[PDB]
Coordinates of C-alpha atoms and ligand atoms in Angstrom, one line a residue:
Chain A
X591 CA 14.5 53.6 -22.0
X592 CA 14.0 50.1 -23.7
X593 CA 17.0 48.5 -21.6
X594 CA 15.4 49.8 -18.5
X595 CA 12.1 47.8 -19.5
X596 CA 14.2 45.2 -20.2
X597 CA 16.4 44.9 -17.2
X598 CA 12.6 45.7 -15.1
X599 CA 10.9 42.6 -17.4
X600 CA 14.2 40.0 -17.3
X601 CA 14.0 40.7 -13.1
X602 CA 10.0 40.2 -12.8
X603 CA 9.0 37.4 -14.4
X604 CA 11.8 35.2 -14.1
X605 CA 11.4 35.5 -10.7
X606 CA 7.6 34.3 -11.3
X607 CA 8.9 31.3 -12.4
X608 CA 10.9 30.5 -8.9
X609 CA 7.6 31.2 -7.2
X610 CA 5.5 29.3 -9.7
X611 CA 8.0 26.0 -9.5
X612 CA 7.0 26.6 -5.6
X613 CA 3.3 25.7 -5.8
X614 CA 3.5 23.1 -7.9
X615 CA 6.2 20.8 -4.9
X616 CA 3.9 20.4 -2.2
X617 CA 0.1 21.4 -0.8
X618 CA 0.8 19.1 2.1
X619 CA -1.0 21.1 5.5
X620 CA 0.9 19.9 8.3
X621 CA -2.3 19.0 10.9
X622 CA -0.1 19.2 13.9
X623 CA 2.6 17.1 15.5
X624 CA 1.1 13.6 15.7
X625 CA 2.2 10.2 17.8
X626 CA 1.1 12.6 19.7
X627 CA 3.9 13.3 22.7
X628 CA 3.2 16.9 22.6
X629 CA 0.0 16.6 25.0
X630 CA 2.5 15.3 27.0
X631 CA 5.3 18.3 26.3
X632 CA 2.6 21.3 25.3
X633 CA -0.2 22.7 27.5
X634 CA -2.0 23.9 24.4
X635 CA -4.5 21.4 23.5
X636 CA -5.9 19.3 26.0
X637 CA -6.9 15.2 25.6
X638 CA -8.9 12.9 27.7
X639 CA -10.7 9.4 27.6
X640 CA -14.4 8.4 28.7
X641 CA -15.2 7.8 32.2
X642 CA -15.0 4.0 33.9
X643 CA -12.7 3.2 30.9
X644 CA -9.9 0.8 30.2
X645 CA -7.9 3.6 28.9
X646 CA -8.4 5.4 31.9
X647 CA -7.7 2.9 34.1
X648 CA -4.9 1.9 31.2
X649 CA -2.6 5.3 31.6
X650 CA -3.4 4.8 35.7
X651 CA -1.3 1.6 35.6
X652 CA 0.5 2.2 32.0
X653 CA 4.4 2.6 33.4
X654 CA 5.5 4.2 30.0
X655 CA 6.9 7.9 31.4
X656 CA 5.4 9.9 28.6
X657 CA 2.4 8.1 29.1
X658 CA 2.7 8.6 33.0
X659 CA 3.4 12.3 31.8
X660 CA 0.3 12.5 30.1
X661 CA -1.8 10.3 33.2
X662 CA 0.1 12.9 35.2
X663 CA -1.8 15.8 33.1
X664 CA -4.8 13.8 32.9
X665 CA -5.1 13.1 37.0
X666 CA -4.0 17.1 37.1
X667 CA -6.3 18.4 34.0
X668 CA -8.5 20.8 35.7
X669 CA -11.6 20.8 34.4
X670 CA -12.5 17.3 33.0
X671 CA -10.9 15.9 30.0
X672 CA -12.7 13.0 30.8
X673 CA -16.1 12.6 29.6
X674 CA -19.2 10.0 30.3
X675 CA -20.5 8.8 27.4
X676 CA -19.2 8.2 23.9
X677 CA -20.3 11.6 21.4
X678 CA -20.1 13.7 24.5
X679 CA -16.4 13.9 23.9
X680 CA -17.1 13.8 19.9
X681 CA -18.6 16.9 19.8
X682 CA -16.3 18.7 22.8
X683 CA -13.6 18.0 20.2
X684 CA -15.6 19.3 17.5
X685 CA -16.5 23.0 19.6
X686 CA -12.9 22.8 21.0
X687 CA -11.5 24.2 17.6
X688 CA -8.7 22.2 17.7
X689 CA -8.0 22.6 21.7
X690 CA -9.0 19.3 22.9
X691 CA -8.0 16.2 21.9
X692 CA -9.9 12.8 22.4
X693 CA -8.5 9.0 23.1
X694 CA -10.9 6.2 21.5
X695 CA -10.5 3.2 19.9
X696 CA -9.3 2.4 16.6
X697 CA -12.6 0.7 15.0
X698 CA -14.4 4.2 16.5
X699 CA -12.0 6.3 14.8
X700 CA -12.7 4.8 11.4
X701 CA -16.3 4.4 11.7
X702 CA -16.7 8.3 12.7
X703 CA -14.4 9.5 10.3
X704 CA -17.1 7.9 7.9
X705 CA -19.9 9.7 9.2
X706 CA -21.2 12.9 8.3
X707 CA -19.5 15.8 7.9
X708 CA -15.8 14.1 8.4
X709 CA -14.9 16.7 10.4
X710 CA -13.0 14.1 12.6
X711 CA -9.3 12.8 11.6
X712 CA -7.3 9.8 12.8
X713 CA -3.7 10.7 13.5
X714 CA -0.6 8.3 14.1
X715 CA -1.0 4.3 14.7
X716 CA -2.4 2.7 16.9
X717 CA -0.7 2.4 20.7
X718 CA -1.2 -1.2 21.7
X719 CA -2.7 -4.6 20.6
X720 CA -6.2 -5.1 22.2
X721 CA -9.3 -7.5 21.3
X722 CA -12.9 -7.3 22.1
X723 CA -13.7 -11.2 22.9
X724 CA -17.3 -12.3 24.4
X725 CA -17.5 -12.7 28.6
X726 CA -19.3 -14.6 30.6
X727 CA -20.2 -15.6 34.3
X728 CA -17.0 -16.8 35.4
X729 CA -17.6 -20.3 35.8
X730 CA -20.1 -20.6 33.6
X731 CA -21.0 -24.1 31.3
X732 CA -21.4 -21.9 28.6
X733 CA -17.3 -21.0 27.9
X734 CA -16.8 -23.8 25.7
X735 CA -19.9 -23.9 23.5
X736 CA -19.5 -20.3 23.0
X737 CA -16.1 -20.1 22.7
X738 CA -15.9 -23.0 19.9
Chain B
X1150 CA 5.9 -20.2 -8.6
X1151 CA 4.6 -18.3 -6.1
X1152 CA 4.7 -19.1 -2.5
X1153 CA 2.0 -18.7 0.5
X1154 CA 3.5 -18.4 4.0
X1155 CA 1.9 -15.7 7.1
X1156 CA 2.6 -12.2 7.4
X1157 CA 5.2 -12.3 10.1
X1158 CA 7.1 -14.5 7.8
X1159 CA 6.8 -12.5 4.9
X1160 CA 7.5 -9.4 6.5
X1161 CA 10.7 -10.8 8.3
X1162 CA 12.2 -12.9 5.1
X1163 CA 11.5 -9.4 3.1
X1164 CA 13.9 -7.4 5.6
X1165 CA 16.8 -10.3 4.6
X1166 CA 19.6 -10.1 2.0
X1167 CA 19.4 -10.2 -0.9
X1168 CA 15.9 -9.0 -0.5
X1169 CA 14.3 -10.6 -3.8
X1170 CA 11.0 -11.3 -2.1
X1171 CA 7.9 -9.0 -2.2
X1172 CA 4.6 -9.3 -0.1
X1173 CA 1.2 -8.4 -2.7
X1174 CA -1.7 -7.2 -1.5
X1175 CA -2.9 -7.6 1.5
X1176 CA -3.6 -10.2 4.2
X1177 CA -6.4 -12.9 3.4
X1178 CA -7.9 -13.7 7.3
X1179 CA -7.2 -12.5 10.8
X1180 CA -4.6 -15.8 12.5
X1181 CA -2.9 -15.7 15.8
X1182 CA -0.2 -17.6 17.2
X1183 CA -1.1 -19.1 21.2
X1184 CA 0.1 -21.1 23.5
X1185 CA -0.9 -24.6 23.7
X1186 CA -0.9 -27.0 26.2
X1187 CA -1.9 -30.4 27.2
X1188 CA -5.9 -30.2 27.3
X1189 CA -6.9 -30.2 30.9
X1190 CA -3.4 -29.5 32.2
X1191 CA -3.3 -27.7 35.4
X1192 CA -1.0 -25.0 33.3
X1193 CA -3.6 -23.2 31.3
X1194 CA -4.7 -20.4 33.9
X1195 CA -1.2 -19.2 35.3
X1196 CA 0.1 -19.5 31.5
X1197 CA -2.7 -17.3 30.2
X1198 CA -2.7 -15.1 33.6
X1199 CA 0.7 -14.5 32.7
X1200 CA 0.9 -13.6 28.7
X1201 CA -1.6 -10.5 29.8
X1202 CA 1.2 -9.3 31.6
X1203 CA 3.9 -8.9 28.9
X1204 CA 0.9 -7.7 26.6
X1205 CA 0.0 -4.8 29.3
X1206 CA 3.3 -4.3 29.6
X1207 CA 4.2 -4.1 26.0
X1208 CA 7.0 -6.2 26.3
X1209 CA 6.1 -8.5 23.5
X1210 CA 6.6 -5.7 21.2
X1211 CA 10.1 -4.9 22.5
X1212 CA 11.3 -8.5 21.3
X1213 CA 8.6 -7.5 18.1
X1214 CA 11.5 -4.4 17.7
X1215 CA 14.3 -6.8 18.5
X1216 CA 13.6 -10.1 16.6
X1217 CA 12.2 -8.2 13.7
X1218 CA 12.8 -4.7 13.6
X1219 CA 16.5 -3.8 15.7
X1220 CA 17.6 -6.7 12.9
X1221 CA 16.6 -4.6 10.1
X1222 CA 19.3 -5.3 7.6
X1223 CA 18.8 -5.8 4.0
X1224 CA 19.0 -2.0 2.8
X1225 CA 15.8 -0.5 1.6
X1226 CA 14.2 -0.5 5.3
X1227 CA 17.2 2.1 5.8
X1228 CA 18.7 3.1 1.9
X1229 CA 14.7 4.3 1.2
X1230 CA 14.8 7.4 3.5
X1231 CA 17.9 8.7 1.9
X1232 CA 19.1 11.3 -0.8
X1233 CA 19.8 11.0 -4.2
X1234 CA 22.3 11.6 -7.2
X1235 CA 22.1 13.6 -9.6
X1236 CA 24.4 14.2 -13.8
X1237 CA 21.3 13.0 -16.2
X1238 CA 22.3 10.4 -18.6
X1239 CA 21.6 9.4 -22.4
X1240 CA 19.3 6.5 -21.6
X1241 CA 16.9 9.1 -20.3
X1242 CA 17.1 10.7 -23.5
X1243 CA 17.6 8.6 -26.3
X1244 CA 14.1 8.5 -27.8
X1245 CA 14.5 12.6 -28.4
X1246 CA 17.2 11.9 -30.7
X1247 CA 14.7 9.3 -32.4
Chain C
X628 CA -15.5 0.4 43.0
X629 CA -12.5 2.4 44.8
X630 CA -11.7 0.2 48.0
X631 CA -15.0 -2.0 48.0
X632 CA -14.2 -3.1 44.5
X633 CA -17.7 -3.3 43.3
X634 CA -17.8 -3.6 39.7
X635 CA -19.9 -1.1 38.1
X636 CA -21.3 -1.1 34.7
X637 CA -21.1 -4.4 32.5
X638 CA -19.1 -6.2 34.9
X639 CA -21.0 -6.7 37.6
X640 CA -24.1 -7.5 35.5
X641 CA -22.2 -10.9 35.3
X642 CA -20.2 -10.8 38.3
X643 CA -22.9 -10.5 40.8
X644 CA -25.5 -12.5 37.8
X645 CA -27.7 -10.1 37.1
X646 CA -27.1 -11.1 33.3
X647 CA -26.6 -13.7 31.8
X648 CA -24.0 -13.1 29.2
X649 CA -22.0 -9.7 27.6
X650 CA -21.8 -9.7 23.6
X651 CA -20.9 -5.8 23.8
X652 CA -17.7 -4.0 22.7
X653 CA -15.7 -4.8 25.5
X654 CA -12.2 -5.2 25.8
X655 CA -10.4 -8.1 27.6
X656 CA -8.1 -6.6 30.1
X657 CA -6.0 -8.4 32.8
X658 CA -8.5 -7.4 35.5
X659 CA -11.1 -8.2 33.8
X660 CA -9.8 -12.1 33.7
X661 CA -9.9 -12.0 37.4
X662 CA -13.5 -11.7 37.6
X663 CA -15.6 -12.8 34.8
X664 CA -14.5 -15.3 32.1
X665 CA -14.3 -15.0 28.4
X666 CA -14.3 -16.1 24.9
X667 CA -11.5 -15.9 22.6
X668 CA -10.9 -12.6 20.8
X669 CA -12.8 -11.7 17.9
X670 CA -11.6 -7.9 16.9
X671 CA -8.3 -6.8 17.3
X672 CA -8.2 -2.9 17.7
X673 CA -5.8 -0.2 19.7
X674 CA -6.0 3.1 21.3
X675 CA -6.5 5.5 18.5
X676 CA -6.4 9.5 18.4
X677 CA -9.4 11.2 17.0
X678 CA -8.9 14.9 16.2
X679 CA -10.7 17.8 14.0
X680 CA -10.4 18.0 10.4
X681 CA -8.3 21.4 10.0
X682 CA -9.9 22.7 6.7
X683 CA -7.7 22.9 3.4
X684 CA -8.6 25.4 1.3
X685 CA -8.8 24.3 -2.3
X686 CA -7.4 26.7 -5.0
X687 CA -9.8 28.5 -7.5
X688 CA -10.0 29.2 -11.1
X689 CA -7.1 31.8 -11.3
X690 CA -4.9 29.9 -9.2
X691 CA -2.2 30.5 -12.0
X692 CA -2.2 34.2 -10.7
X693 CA -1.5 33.1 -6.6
X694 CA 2.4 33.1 -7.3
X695 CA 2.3 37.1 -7.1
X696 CA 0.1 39.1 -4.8
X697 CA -2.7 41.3 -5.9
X698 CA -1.7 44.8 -6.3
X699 CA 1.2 44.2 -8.5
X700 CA -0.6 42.6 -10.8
X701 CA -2.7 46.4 -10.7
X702 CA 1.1 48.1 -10.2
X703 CA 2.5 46.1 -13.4
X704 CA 0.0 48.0 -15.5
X705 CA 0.0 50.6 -14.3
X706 CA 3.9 50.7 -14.8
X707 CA 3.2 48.8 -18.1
X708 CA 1.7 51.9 -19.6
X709 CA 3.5 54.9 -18.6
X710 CA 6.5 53.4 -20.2
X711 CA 5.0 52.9 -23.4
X712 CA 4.2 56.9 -23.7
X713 CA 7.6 58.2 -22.7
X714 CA 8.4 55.9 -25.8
X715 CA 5.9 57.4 -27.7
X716 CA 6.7 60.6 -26.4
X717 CA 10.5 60.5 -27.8
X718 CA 9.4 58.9 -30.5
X719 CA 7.9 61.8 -32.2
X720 CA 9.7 64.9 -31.5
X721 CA 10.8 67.2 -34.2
X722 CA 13.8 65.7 -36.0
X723 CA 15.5 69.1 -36.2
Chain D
X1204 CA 25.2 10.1 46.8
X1205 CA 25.7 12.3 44.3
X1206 CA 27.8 10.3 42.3
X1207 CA 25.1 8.1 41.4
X1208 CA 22.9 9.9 39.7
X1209 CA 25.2 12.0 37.5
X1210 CA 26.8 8.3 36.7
X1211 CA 22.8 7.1 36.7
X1212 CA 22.1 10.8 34.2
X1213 CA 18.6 11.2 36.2
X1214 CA 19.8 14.6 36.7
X1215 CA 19.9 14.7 33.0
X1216 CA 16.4 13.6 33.1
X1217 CA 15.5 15.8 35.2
X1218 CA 17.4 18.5 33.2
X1219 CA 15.2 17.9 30.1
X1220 CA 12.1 17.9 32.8
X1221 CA 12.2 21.4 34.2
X1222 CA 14.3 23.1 30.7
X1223 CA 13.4 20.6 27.3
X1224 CA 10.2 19.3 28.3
X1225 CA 8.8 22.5 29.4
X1226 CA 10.0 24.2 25.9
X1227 CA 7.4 26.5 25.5
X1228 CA 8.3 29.9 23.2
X1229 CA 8.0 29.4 20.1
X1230 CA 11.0 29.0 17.5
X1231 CA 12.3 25.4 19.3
X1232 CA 9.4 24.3 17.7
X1233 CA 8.6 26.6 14.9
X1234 CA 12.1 27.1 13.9
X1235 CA 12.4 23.5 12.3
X1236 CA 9.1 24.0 10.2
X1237 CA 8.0 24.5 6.4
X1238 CA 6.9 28.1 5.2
X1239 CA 4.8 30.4 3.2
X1240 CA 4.9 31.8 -0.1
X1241 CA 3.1 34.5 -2.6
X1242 CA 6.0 37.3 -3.0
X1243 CA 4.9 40.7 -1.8
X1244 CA 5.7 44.2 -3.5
X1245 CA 7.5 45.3 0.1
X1246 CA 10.3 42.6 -1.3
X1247 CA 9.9 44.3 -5.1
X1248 CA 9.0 48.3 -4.3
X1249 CA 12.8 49.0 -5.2
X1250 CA 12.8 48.0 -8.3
X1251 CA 10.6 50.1 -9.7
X1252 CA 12.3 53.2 -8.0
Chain E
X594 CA 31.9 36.7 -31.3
X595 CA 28.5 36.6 -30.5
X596 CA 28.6 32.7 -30.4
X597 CA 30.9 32.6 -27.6
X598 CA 28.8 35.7 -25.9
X599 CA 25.8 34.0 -26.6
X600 CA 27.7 30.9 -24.8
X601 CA 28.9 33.2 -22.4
X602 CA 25.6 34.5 -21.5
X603 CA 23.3 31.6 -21.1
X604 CA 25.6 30.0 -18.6
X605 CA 24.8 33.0 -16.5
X606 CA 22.1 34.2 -16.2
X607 CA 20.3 30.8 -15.5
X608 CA 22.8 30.6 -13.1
X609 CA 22.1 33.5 -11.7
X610 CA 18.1 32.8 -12.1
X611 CA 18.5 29.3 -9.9
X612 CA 16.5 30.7 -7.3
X613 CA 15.9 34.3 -6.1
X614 CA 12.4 34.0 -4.4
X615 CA 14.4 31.5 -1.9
X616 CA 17.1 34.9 -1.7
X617 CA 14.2 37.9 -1.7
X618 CA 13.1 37.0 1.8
X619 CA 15.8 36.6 4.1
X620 CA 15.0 39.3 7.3
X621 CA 18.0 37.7 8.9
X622 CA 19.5 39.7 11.6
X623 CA 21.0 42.7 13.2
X624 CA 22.8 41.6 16.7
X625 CA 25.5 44.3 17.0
X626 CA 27.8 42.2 20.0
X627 CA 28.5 39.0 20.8
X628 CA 31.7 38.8 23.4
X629 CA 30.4 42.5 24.5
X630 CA 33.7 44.7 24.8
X631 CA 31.9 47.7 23.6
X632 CA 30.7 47.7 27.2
X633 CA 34.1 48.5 27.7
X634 CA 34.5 51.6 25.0
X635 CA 31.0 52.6 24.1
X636 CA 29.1 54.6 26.8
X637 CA 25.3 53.6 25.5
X638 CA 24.0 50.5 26.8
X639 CA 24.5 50.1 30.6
X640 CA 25.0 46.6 32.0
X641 CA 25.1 45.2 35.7
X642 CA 24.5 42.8 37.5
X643 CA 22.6 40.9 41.0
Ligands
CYZ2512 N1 -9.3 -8.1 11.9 S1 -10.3 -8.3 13.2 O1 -9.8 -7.4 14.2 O2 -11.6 -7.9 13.0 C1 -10.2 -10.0 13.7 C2 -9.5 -10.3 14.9 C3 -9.4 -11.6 15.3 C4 -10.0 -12.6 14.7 C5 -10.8 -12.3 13.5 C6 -10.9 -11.0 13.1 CL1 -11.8 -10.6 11.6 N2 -9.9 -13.9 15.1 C7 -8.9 -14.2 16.1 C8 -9.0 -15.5 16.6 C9 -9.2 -16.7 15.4 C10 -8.0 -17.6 15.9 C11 -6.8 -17.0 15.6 C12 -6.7 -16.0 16.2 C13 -7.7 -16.0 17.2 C14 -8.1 -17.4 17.3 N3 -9.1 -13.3 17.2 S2 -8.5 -11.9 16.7 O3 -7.0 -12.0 16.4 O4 -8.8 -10.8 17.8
LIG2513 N1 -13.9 -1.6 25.4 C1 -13.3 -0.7 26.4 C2 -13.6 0.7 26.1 C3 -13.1 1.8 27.0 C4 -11.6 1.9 27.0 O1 -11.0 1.6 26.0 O2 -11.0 2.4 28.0 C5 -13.8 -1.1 27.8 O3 -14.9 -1.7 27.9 O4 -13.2 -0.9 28.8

């Protein structure tokens, strides 16, 4: 009997061990596939910008084919991805459960990621360069003494 | 002796052989390289027209790949991504025997 | 505006002067240049992607017992005792 | 005029458009992906017979 | 004896216990043709064509 109970303990828990080294590598969840080029290749979750935006305007004129792919979605996303005003999107993504995405700037992203209850996340870099920079009446005196 | 230089250089000197440098911490301010001209030249507005372009158009950062990045040589921009080796030696455990 | 190209918004609060200047967060663009002018930039940024936080679970107190499911952990006993009687039950058993 | 775009590979392009781009089921995706754990008694039941 | 059994043993079975949770859950495949030819000899599964 005893090298039964032997042979049935020397199987068991050495094979707890392969499963216990298992949890201790990695608790990484994966938060899907970022840079995010699967709006372009998936229909699953959609993505959109604000109305009369840059961005808007930006994937209308950006020559890039994934992101003509994606202003092809976005000129063929039926209903609106876009939306008018600034939380109005915010909280679409937050009922969406994970089925609509949401383009915004990078000094948003942080600043509602700090707010209450972090439900947000920023995913990926950046995708360009730009720079808020104070406009005037074109023509105005007051460029320079501004400006300096 | 250490050294101060900008970002772009330190980034870009790092990426060469042998490379013995190393950025710490952070930036200190927020520079940017333009283009200058003679003040009052008839030049500034279809120079400055003209760099919004290559911005929009991202081309800037395809010479940023190519003078910068498509140049990466010296080894651990490449040689950190890698696998490893394996056959433990002593050195690791010398102070056991101690 | 499509094909009159009347600027809605904050831009045509200075490009026909109904303001007098813009500090807002607004982004130089090329077409922008074309029709108001501007400052030198003051806060670089990008087009970021803002999506949900999907909810990690944390693990609990008996998170030592996770690496094997729940009923074999009841099955072990129960296996654990009924070999220990057939032991005991050839242990003692009439030496004759 | 043929010649072109196979020398050009827009048809290649265009391959990826209407057979790579559009992969939808399942395991080209999922099939290069991480897994699950916490061993179940269906993969131990034998043992104890 | 013992000391080269002993030996003998410990090489093994850790060997043998280098993993077997990665070899408990496989679920791999059944796929009974490839390059069909049972078509040919087998009378079970039918097969045409447009
Ligand atoms: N880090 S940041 O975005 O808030 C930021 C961005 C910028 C700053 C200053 C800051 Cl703090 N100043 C620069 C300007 C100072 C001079 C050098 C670069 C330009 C002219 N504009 S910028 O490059 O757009
Ligand atoms: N600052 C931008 C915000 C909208 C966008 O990024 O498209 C603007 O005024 O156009």
């Amino acid at each position: 009997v005893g090298g039964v109970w032997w042979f049935f303990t020397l199987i068991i828990i050495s094979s707890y061990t392969a499963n216990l080294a298992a949890f201790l590598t990695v608790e990484r969840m994966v938060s899907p596939i970022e840079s995010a080029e699967d709006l372009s290749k998936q229909t699953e979750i959609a993505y959109g910008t604000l109305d009369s935006g840059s961005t808007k305007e930006f994937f209308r004129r950006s020559k890039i084919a994934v992101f003509d792919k994606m202003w092809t979605y976005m000129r063929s996303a039926e209903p609106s991805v876009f939306v008018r005003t600034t939380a109005e999107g915010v909280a679409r993504v937050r009922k969406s459960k994970g089925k609509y995405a949401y383009l915004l700037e990078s000094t948003m992203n942080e600043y509602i990621e700090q707010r209450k209850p972090c439900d947000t996340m920023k995913v990926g870099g950046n995708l360009d360069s730009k720079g808020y920079g104070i406009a005037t009446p074109k023509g105005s005196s007051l460029g320079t003494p501004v400006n300096l | 002796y250490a050294y101060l230089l900008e970002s772009t250089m330190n980034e870009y000197i790092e990426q060469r052989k042998p490379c013995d440098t190393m950025k710490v911490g952070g930036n200190l301010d927020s520079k940017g390289y333009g283009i200058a001209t003679p003040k009052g030249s008839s030049l500034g507005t279809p120079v400055n027209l003209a760099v919004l372009k290559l911005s929009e158009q991202g081309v800037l950062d395809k010479l940023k790949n190519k003078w910068w990045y498509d140049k990466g040589e010296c080894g651990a921009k490449d040689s950190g991504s890698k696998e490893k080796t394996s056959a433990l030696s002593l050195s690791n455990v010398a102070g056991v025997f101690y | 505006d499509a094909d009159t190209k009347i600027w809605n918004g904050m831009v045509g609060e200075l490009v026909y002067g109904k303001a007098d200047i813009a500090i807002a967060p607004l982004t130089i663009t090329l077409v922008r240049e074309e029709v108001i002018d501007f400052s030198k930039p003051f806060m670089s940024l990008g087009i970021s992607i803002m999506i949900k936080k999907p909810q990690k679970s944390k693990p609990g107190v008996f998170s030592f017992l996770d690496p094997l499911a729940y009923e074999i952990w009841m099955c072990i006993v129960f296996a654990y005792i009924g070999v220990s009687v057939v032991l005991f039950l050839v242990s003692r058993f009439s030496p004759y």
